[PDB]
Amino acid sequence: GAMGSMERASLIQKAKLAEQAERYEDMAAFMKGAVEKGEELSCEERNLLSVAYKNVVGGQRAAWRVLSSIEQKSNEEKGPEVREYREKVETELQGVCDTVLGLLDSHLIKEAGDAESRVFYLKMKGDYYRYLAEVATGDDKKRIIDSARSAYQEAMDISKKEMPPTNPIRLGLALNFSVFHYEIANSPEEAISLAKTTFDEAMADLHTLSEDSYKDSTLIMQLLRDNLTLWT
Amino acid sequence: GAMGSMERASLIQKAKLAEQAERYEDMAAFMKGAVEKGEELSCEERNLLSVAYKNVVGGQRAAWRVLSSIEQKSNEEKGPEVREYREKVETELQGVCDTVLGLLDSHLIKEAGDAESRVFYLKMKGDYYRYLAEVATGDDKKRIIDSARSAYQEAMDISKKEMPPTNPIRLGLALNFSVFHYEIANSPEEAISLAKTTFDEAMADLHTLSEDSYKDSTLIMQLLRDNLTLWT
Amino acid sequence: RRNASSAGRLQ
Amino acid sequence: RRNASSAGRLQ
Ligand SMILES: [Mg+2]
Ligand SMILES: [Mg+2]
Ligand SMILES: [Mg+2]
Ligand SMILES: [Mg+2]
Ligand SMILES: [Mg+2]
Ligand SMILES: [Mg+2]
Ligand SMILES: [Mg+2]
Ligand SMILES: [Mg+2]
């Protein structure tokens, strides 16, 4: 608890300042601090946690892909440096994924009783196991993929019972599970069927929304469409 | 010496991999390691050191300006959080500046005998004192500004005796000293006179250059011109 | 392009 | 604009 001595409200305030400053490592440390106070997170606070770690692992994943690509070219028809540096980046990425999954397990998920909070955290759990799956190569890979699938499936079952088809969390979950199917599970047809069904069911529910909800739903539906255009 | 156990050649190789991956903190740690081996740096190695720290302090300076701007708005016609977080960022920025100035003093500058190496390191010394000056507010500010001025002036005296007016290090030094005059020393007229004289003397020496040297010189001369257009 | 995944913030 | 300073790499 590096943030153990700071007020919860001060950690949340500083997480917002870090977002404005694009200091995403600081933002993640502040939001880890806030979570470790042991209170549940509001909608906005869950978004701060998700934004902060998304951006930290986003930069690690982009770095890993650059290095892994240089490493693969070195192994076509040199020393250990490229492998060693890819491993260093990969190890730091796995640590950030382990930290997020740790917060979800201790104790965000078990205290999340509302559909919007529970689905949000289960989606995150799927996402961080998916990032681990992206770099996994040993004995653990099958179990990592199944941990992602299981978290996403539990989130999907709740979202389908409890949320309208245009709910941005439900739409964001479905988008991410479809990327899981395409990129990780080697199931491009499942990816394409989930993205299509998700898009079509949201389309048929747009008439119920305010101009502001409409704009949040259609932004994510456009990412389903961009993926389907790429995949078909 | 965190990098004490890695080969100099491995640190340089990994600094290049970090640049490709945009992992500038890693790149700076690798190049600090290389410097601490105690050998002089080649031209390309000096560029790796300069790129790595430029990008690390670049992100700290951008963060500091966002926070300092929010802090100033809070003090017009709230709690300690904005001030506390600006101070945290400012303290980390000062530490990176102290680390660079430490490497220049121990022992890059005293072993730099060639004009291109000595001017490059003195320019850097001016630059990192300038970054300190940008956030300085107490008893030390006048001495920080004078440390910048003194490093830049020594670099300018050597560049004028030893380098042609189109030398990219000489041009980059003159550009940075002119920004010092305008932004730090409150001397906009000195800024404008140095940028003009630097541009005009380089223009008159372009005829001596290869198409490749021409392209390096004119890139930096365009930044002198952009500044003069902004300042006049 | 690359595969698009959801933004960090959804609403 | 903001004041332009030199790139990290000069040549
Ligand atoms: Mg309290
Ligand atoms: Mg309290
Ligand atoms: Mg088919
Ligand atoms: Mg088929
Ligand atoms: Mg050796
Ligand atoms: Mg050796
Ligand atoms: Mg005048
Ligand atoms: Mg005047």
Coordinates of C-alpha atoms and ligand atoms in Angstrom, one line a residue:
Chain A
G1 CA 0.0 0.0 0.0
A2 CA 2.2 2.8 -1.4
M3 CA -1.0 5.0 -1.5
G4 CA -2.1 3.7 2.0
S5 CA -1.6 7.2 3.6
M6 CA -3.5 9.2 0.9
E7 CA -7.3 9.9 1.2
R8 CA -9.5 7.9 -1.2
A9 CA -11.0 11.2 -2.5
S10 CA -7.4 12.6 -3.1
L11 CA -6.4 9.4 -5.0
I12 CA -9.5 9.8 -7.3
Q13 CA -8.8 13.5 -7.8
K14 CA -5.2 12.8 -8.7
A15 CA -6.2 9.9 -11.0
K16 CA -8.3 12.6 -13.0
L17 CA -5.3 15.0 -13.0
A18 CA -3.0 12.1 -14.3
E19 CA -5.5 11.3 -17.1
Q20 CA -5.4 15.1 -18.2
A21 CA -1.5 15.0 -18.0
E22 CA -1.4 11.6 -19.9
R23 CA 0.5 10.1 -16.9
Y24 CA -1.1 6.7 -17.1
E25 CA 1.4 4.9 -14.8
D26 CA 0.6 7.5 -12.0
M27 CA -3.1 7.2 -12.9
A28 CA -3.0 3.3 -12.4
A29 CA -1.0 3.7 -9.1
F30 CA -3.6 6.2 -7.8
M31 CA -6.6 3.9 -8.9
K32 CA -4.9 0.8 -7.4
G33 CA -4.6 2.9 -4.2
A34 CA -8.3 3.9 -4.3
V35 CA -9.4 0.2 -4.9
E36 CA -7.2 -1.0 -1.9
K37 CA -9.3 1.4 0.4
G38 CA -11.8 -1.5 0.2
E39 CA -14.9 0.5 -0.8
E40 CA -16.8 -0.4 -4.1
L41 CA -16.1 1.9 -7.1
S42 CA -18.7 4.2 -8.7
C43 CA -19.3 4.0 -12.5
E44 CA -16.9 7.0 -13.1
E45 CA -14.2 5.4 -10.8
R46 CA -14.5 2.0 -12.6
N47 CA -13.9 4.0 -15.8
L48 CA -10.8 5.7 -14.3
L49 CA -9.4 2.2 -13.3
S50 CA -10.1 0.8 -16.8
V51 CA -8.6 3.8 -18.6
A52 CA -5.5 3.8 -16.5
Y53 CA -4.5 0.1 -16.9
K54 CA -5.7 0.0 -20.6
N55 CA -3.2 2.8 -21.4
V56 CA -0.3 1.2 -19.4
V57 CA -0.7 -2.3 -20.9
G58 CA -1.5 -0.6 -24.3
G59 CA 2.1 0.8 -24.4
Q60 CA 3.6 -2.5 -23.2
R61 CA 1.6 -4.5 -25.8
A62 CA 2.7 -2.1 -28.7
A63 CA 6.4 -2.4 -27.4
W64 CA 6.1 -6.2 -27.2
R65 CA 4.7 -6.5 -30.8
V66 CA 7.6 -4.2 -32.2
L67 CA 10.2 -6.4 -30.3
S68 CA 8.5 -9.8 -31.1
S69 CA 8.5 -8.8 -34.8
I70 CA 12.3 -7.9 -34.8
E71 CA 12.9 -11.3 -32.9
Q72 CA 10.9 -13.3 -35.6
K73 CA 12.9 -11.7 -38.4
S74 CA 16.2 -12.7 -36.6
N75 CA 15.0 -16.4 -36.7
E76 CA 14.3 -16.5 -40.6
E77 CA 16.3 -18.4 -43.3
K78 CA 22.9 -12.5 -33.8
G79 CA 23.0 -12.5 -30.0
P80 CA 20.5 -12.9 -27.1
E81 CA 19.7 -9.1 -26.8
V82 CA 16.4 -9.0 -28.8
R83 CA 15.0 -12.1 -27.0
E84 CA 16.3 -10.8 -23.6
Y85 CA 14.6 -7.4 -24.1
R86 CA 11.4 -8.9 -25.5
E87 CA 11.3 -11.1 -22.3
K88 CA 11.9 -8.0 -20.0
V89 CA 8.9 -6.1 -21.7
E90 CA 6.8 -9.4 -21.6
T91 CA 7.6 -9.9 -17.9
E92 CA 6.5 -6.3 -17.1
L93 CA 3.3 -6.7 -19.2
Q94 CA 2.5 -10.0 -17.3
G95 CA 3.1 -8.2 -13.9
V96 CA 0.6 -5.3 -14.9
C97 CA -2.0 -8.0 -16.0
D98 CA -1.3 -9.9 -12.6
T99 CA -1.9 -6.7 -10.7
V100 CA -5.3 -5.9 -12.4
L101 CA -6.5 -9.6 -12.0
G102 CA -5.4 -9.3 -8.4
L103 CA -7.5 -6.3 -7.8
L104 CA -10.5 -7.9 -9.6
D105 CA -10.1 -11.0 -7.3
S106 CA -9.4 -9.0 -4.1
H107 CA -12.2 -8.0 -3.9
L108 CA -13.9 -6.0 -6.7
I109 CA -15.8 -8.9 -8.4
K110 CA -17.1 -10.7 -5.2
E111 CA -18.6 -7.3 -3.9
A112 CA -20.0 -6.3 -7.4
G113 CA -23.8 -7.1 -7.1
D114 CA -25.3 -4.7 -9.8
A115 CA -25.2 -6.0 -13.4
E116 CA -23.3 -2.8 -14.6
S117 CA -20.5 -3.2 -12.0
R118 CA -20.3 -7.1 -12.2
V119 CA -20.3 -7.2 -16.1
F120 CA -17.7 -4.3 -16.2
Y121 CA -15.3 -6.3 -13.9
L122 CA -15.8 -9.6 -15.6
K123 CA -15.1 -8.0 -19.0
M124 CA -11.9 -6.5 -17.5
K125 CA -11.0 -10.0 -16.2
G126 CA -11.5 -11.4 -19.7
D127 CA -9.5 -8.5 -21.2
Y128 CA -6.4 -9.0 -18.9
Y129 CA -6.4 -12.8 -19.4
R130 CA -6.6 -12.0 -23.2
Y131 CA -3.5 -9.8 -22.9
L132 CA -1.7 -12.6 -21.1
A133 CA -2.9 -15.1 -23.8
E134 CA -1.4 -12.7 -26.5
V135 CA 2.2 -13.4 -25.1
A136 CA 1.6 -17.0 -23.7
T137 CA 3.7 -19.8 -25.3
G138 CA 4.3 -22.5 -22.6
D139 CA 2.2 -25.1 -20.6
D140 CA -0.1 -22.4 -19.2
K141 CA -1.4 -21.0 -22.6
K142 CA -4.5 -23.3 -22.8
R143 CA -5.5 -22.4 -19.2
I144 CA -5.0 -18.6 -19.8
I145 CA -7.3 -18.8 -22.9
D146 CA -9.9 -20.7 -20.9
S147 CA -9.7 -18.2 -18.0
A148 CA -10.4 -15.3 -20.6
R149 CA -13.3 -17.4 -22.2
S150 CA -14.9 -18.2 -18.8
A151 CA -14.8 -14.5 -17.5
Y152 CA -16.2 -13.2 -20.9
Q153 CA -18.9 -15.9 -20.9
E154 CA -20.1 -15.1 -17.4
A155 CA -20.1 -11.4 -18.3
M156 CA -22.1 -12.2 -21.5
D157 CA -24.7 -14.4 -19.6
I158 CA -25.3 -11.5 -17.1
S159 CA -25.4 -8.7 -19.8
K160 CA -27.9 -10.7 -21.9
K161 CA -30.3 -11.2 -18.8
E162 CA -29.8 -7.7 -17.2
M163 CA -28.9 -5.0 -19.8
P164 CA -30.5 -3.7 -23.1
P165 CA -28.6 -4.6 -26.3
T166 CA -27.3 -1.0 -26.7
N167 CA -25.8 -0.8 -23.1
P168 CA -22.2 0.5 -23.8
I169 CA -20.7 -2.1 -21.3
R170 CA -22.6 -5.0 -23.0
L171 CA -21.5 -3.7 -26.5
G172 CA -17.9 -3.2 -25.3
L173 CA -17.9 -6.7 -23.8
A174 CA -19.3 -8.3 -27.0
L175 CA -16.7 -6.4 -29.2
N176 CA -13.9 -7.7 -26.9
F177 CA -15.2 -11.3 -26.8
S178 CA -15.4 -11.3 -30.6
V179 CA -11.7 -10.1 -30.8
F180 CA -10.9 -12.9 -28.3
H181 CA -12.6 -15.5 -30.7
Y182 CA -10.8 -14.1 -33.8
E183 CA -7.3 -13.3 -32.4
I184 CA -6.9 -15.8 -29.5
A185 CA -9.3 -18.8 -29.8
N186 CA -8.7 -19.3 -33.6
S187 CA -12.5 -19.1 -34.1
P188 CA -13.0 -16.4 -36.8
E189 CA -16.6 -17.7 -37.5
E190 CA -17.6 -17.3 -33.8
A191 CA -16.0 -13.8 -33.9
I192 CA -18.0 -12.8 -37.1
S193 CA -21.3 -14.3 -35.7
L194 CA -21.0 -12.6 -32.4
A195 CA -20.1 -9.1 -33.9
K196 CA -23.1 -9.4 -36.4
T197 CA -25.7 -10.5 -33.9
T198 CA -24.4 -7.8 -31.4
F199 CA -24.6 -5.1 -34.1
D200 CA -28.1 -6.1 -35.4
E201 CA -29.7 -6.4 -31.8
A202 CA -28.2 -3.0 -30.9
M203 CA -29.5 -1.4 -34.2
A204 CA -33.1 -2.6 -33.4
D205 CA -32.9 -1.0 -29.9
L206 CA -31.5 2.5 -30.9
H207 CA -35.1 3.9 -31.1
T208 CA -35.4 3.7 -27.3
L209 CA -32.3 6.0 -26.7
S210 CA -31.7 9.8 -26.0
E211 CA -29.3 11.5 -28.5
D212 CA -26.5 11.1 -25.8
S213 CA -27.1 7.3 -25.2
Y214 CA -27.5 7.0 -29.1
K215 CA -24.0 8.5 -29.6
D216 CA -22.3 6.2 -26.9
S217 CA -23.9 3.0 -28.5
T218 CA -23.2 3.9 -32.1
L219 CA -19.5 4.7 -31.4
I220 CA -19.0 1.1 -30.2
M221 CA -21.3 -0.4 -32.9
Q222 CA -19.0 1.4 -35.5
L223 CA -16.0 -0.7 -34.0
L224 CA -18.1 -3.9 -34.5
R225 CA -18.6 -2.8 -38.2
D226 CA -14.9 -1.9 -38.7
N227 CA -14.0 -5.4 -37.4
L228 CA -16.6 -7.1 -39.7
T229 CA -15.3 -5.1 -42.7
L230 CA -11.7 -6.3 -41.8
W231 CA -12.8 -9.9 -41.2
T232 CA -15.1 -10.5 -44.3
Chain B
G1 CA 25.0 0.6 -11.6
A2 CA 21.8 -1.4 -12.4
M3 CA 23.3 -2.1 -15.9
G4 CA 26.8 -2.8 -14.4
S5 CA 26.5 -6.6 -15.4
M6 CA 25.5 -6.0 -19.0
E7 CA 28.0 -5.6 -21.9
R8 CA 28.5 -2.0 -23.3
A9 CA 27.6 -3.4 -26.8
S10 CA 24.4 -5.1 -25.4
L11 CA 23.3 -1.8 -23.7
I12 CA 23.8 0.1 -27.0
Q13 CA 22.0 -2.6 -29.0
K14 CA 19.1 -2.6 -26.5
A15 CA 19.0 1.3 -26.5
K16 CA 18.3 1.0 -30.3
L17 CA 15.6 -1.7 -29.7
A18 CA 14.0 0.6 -27.0
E19 CA 13.9 3.6 -29.5
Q20 CA 12.1 1.4 -32.1
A21 CA 9.6 0.3 -29.3
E22 CA 9.3 3.9 -28.1
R23 CA 10.4 2.7 -24.6
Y24 CA 12.3 5.9 -23.8
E25 CA 12.7 5.2 -20.0
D26 CA 14.3 1.8 -20.8
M27 CA 16.4 3.6 -23.6
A28 CA 17.7 6.2 -21.0
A29 CA 18.5 3.4 -18.4
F30 CA 20.4 1.5 -21.2
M31 CA 22.4 4.6 -22.3
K32 CA 23.1 5.7 -18.6
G33 CA 24.5 2.1 -18.3
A34 CA 26.7 2.5 -21.5
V35 CA 28.0 5.9 -20.3
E36 CA 28.9 4.5 -16.8
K37 CA 31.2 1.9 -18.6
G38 CA 33.6 4.9 -18.7
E39 CA 34.4 4.8 -22.4
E40 CA 33.7 7.9 -24.6
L41 CA 30.6 7.8 -26.8
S42 CA 30.6 7.8 -30.7
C43 CA 28.5 10.3 -32.6
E44 CA 25.6 7.7 -33.0
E45 CA 25.9 6.8 -29.2
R46 CA 25.7 10.5 -28.1
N47 CA 22.6 10.8 -30.3
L48 CA 21.1 7.7 -28.5
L49 CA 21.7 9.3 -25.1
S50 CA 20.3 12.7 -26.3
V51 CA 17.1 11.1 -27.8
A52 CA 16.5 8.9 -24.8
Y53 CA 16.6 11.7 -22.1
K54 CA 14.9 14.3 -24.5
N55 CA 11.8 12.0 -24.7
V56 CA 11.7 11.1 -21.0
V57 CA 12.0 14.8 -19.9
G58 CA 9.7 15.8 -22.9
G59 CA 6.8 13.8 -21.3
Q60 CA 7.6 15.1 -17.8
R61 CA 7.6 18.8 -19.1
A62 CA 4.3 18.3 -21.0
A63 CA 2.7 16.8 -17.9
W64 CA 4.1 19.6 -15.7
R65 CA 2.7 22.3 -18.0
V66 CA -0.8 20.6 -18.0
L67 CA -0.7 20.5 -14.1
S68 CA 0.8 23.9 -13.6
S69 CA -1.9 25.4 -15.8
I70 CA -4.7 23.6 -13.8
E71 CA -2.9 24.9 -10.5
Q72 CA -2.8 28.6 -11.9
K73 CA -6.6 28.4 -12.7
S74 CA -7.3 27.2 -9.1
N75 CA -5.5 30.4 -7.8
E76 CA -7.7 33.0 -9.8
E77 CA -10.4 35.5 -8.5
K78 CA -10.0 23.6 -3.5
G79 CA -7.5 21.3 -1.7
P80 CA -3.7 20.6 -1.9
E81 CA -4.0 17.8 -4.5
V82 CA -3.1 19.8 -7.8
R83 CA -0.1 21.5 -6.0
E84 CA 1.0 18.1 -4.5
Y85 CA 0.8 16.3 -7.9
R86 CA 2.5 19.2 -9.8
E87 CA 5.3 19.0 -7.1
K88 CA 5.6 15.1 -7.6
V89 CA 5.9 15.5 -11.4
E90 CA 8.3 18.5 -10.9
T91 CA 10.5 16.5 -8.4
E92 CA 10.7 13.5 -10.9
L93 CA 11.6 16.0 -13.8
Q94 CA 14.4 17.6 -11.6
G95 CA 15.8 14.1 -10.8
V96 CA 16.0 13.2 -14.6
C97 CA 17.7 16.6 -15.2
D98 CA 20.1 15.9 -12.2
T99 CA 20.9 12.4 -13.6
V100 CA 21.8 13.8 -17.1
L101 CA 23.9 16.7 -15.6
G102 CA 25.6 14.1 -13.4
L103 CA 26.6 12.0 -16.4
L104 CA 27.9 15.1 -18.3
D105 CA 30.0 16.1 -15.2
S106 CA 31.1 12.4 -14.5
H107 CA 32.9 12.3 -16.9
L108 CA 31.6 13.0 -20.5
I109 CA 32.5 16.7 -20.8
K110 CA 36.1 16.5 -19.3
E111 CA 37.0 13.6 -21.7
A112 CA 35.3 15.3 -24.8
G113 CA 38.3 16.8 -26.7
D114 CA 36.8 16.9 -30.3
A115 CA 34.7 20.0 -31.1
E116 CA 31.7 17.8 -32.2
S117 CA 31.7 15.8 -28.9
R118 CA 32.4 18.8 -26.6
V119 CA 29.8 21.1 -28.2
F120 CA 27.2 18.3 -28.2
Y121 CA 27.7 17.8 -24.4
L122 CA 27.8 21.5 -23.5
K123 CA 24.6 22.0 -25.5
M124 CA 23.0 19.1 -23.5
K125 CA 24.3 20.7 -20.2
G126 CA 22.6 24.1 -21.3
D127 CA 19.4 22.2 -22.3
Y128 CA 19.0 20.3 -18.9
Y129 CA 19.7 23.5 -16.9
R130 CA 17.1 25.2 -19.1
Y131 CA 14.5 22.5 -18.2
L132 CA 15.4 23.0 -14.5
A133 CA 15.0 26.8 -15.1
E134 CA 11.5 26.2 -16.6
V135 CA 10.2 24.9 -13.2
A136 CA 12.6 26.9 -10.9
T137 CA 10.9 29.5 -8.5
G138 CA 13.0 29.8 -5.3
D139 CA 16.5 31.1 -4.3
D140 CA 18.3 28.9 -6.9
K141 CA 16.5 30.2 -10.1
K142 CA 19.1 32.9 -11.0
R143 CA 22.0 30.4 -10.5
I144 CA 20.2 27.7 -12.7
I145 CA 19.6 30.3 -15.5
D146 CA 23.3 31.4 -15.3
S147 CA 24.4 27.7 -15.4
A148 CA 22.4 27.2 -18.6
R149 CA 23.8 30.5 -20.1
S150 CA 27.4 29.6 -19.2
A151 CA 27.2 26.0 -20.7
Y152 CA 25.5 27.4 -24.0
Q153 CA 28.1 30.3 -24.2
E154 CA 31.1 27.9 -23.9
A155 CA 29.4 25.6 -26.6
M156 CA 28.8 28.6 -28.9
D157 CA 32.5 29.9 -28.5
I158 CA 33.8 26.4 -29.5
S159 CA 31.2 25.9 -32.4
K160 CA 32.1 29.3 -33.9
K161 CA 35.9 28.6 -33.8
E162 CA 35.7 24.9 -34.9
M163 CA 32.5 24.1 -37.0
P164 CA 31.1 25.5 -40.2
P165 CA 27.8 27.5 -39.8
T166 CA 25.7 24.6 -41.3
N167 CA 27.0 22.0 -38.8
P168 CA 23.7 20.4 -37.4
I169 CA 25.1 20.5 -33.7
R170 CA 26.1 24.2 -34.1
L171 CA 22.6 25.0 -35.6
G172 CA 20.8 22.9 -32.9
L173 CA 22.9 24.7 -30.2
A174 CA 22.1 28.2 -31.7
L175 CA 18.3 27.3 -32.0
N176 CA 18.3 26.1 -28.3
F177 CA 20.3 29.1 -27.0
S178 CA 17.8 31.5 -28.8
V179 CA 14.9 29.7 -27.1
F180 CA 16.8 30.1 -23.8
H181 CA 17.0 33.9 -24.4
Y182 CA 13.3 34.2 -25.4
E183 CA 11.6 31.8 -22.9
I184 CA 14.1 31.9 -19.8
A185 CA 16.3 35.0 -19.9
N186 CA 13.5 37.4 -20.8
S187 CA 15.7 38.6 -23.8
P188 CA 13.4 38.3 -26.8
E189 CA 15.7 40.7 -28.9
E190 CA 18.8 38.6 -28.2
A191 CA 16.7 35.5 -29.2
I192 CA 15.6 37.1 -32.5
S193 CA 19.2 38.4 -33.3
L194 CA 20.8 35.0 -32.6
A195 CA 18.1 33.1 -34.7
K196 CA 18.5 35.6 -37.7
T197 CA 22.4 35.7 -37.6
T198 CA 22.4 31.8 -37.3
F199 CA 19.9 31.4 -40.2
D200 CA 21.7 33.9 -42.6
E201 CA 25.3 32.5 -41.9
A202 CA 24.0 28.9 -42.6
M203 CA 22.2 30.0 -45.8
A204 CA 25.5 31.5 -47.1
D205 CA 27.3 28.1 -46.4
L206 CA 24.6 25.7 -48.0
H207 CA 26.5 25.7 -51.4
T208 CA 29.4 23.7 -49.8
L209 CA 27.1 20.7 -48.8
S210 CA 26.1 17.4 -50.3
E211 CA 22.3 16.8 -50.8
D212 CA 22.3 14.7 -47.5
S213 CA 24.2 17.4 -45.4
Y214 CA 21.9 20.1 -47.1
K215 CA 18.8 18.2 -45.9
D216 CA 20.1 18.0 -42.2
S217 CA 21.1 21.7 -42.1
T218 CA 17.8 23.0 -43.8
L219 CA 15.6 20.9 -41.4
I220 CA 17.1 22.9 -38.4
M221 CA 17.2 26.2 -40.3
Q222 CA 13.4 25.8 -40.8
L223 CA 12.9 25.6 -36.9
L224 CA 14.9 28.9 -36.7
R225 CA 12.5 30.4 -39.3
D226 CA 9.3 29.0 -37.5
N227 CA 10.5 30.6 -34.3
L228 CA 11.3 34.0 -36.0
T229 CA 7.8 33.9 -37.6
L230 CA 6.3 33.2 -34.1
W231 CA 8.4 35.9 -32.5
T232 CA 8.1 38.8 -35.0
Chain C
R1 CA -6.0 -2.1 -40.1
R2 CA -5.6 -3.9 -36.7
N3 CA -8.5 -5.5 -34.7
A4 CA -10.4 -2.8 -32.8
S5 CA -11.2 -3.4 -29.1
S6 CA -13.3 -1.3 -26.7
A7 CA -12.0 2.1 -25.3
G8 CA -11.1 2.1 -21.6
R9 CA -14.1 4.3 -20.9
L10 CA -17.5 3.0 -22.3
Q11 CA -19.9 5.8 -21.2
Chain D
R1 CA 2.4 27.5 -32.0
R2 CA 5.0 26.7 -29.1
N3 CA 8.7 27.6 -29.3
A4 CA 10.6 24.9 -31.4
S5 CA 13.8 23.4 -29.9
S6 CA 16.2 21.0 -31.6
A7 CA 15.4 17.3 -32.0
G8 CA 17.3 14.8 -29.8
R9 CA 19.2 13.5 -32.9
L10 CA 20.8 16.3 -35.0
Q11 CA 22.5 14.2 -37.9
Ligands
MG1 MG -10.3 8.5 4.8
MG2 MG -12.0 9.3 4.0
MG3 MG -17.7 -19.5 -43.1
MG4 MG -15.4 -19.9 -43.5
MG5 MG 32.9 -5.8 -21.5
MG6 MG 33.3 -5.4 -23.5
MG7 MG 13.2 45.7 -30.9
MG8 MG 11.4 45.6 -29.4

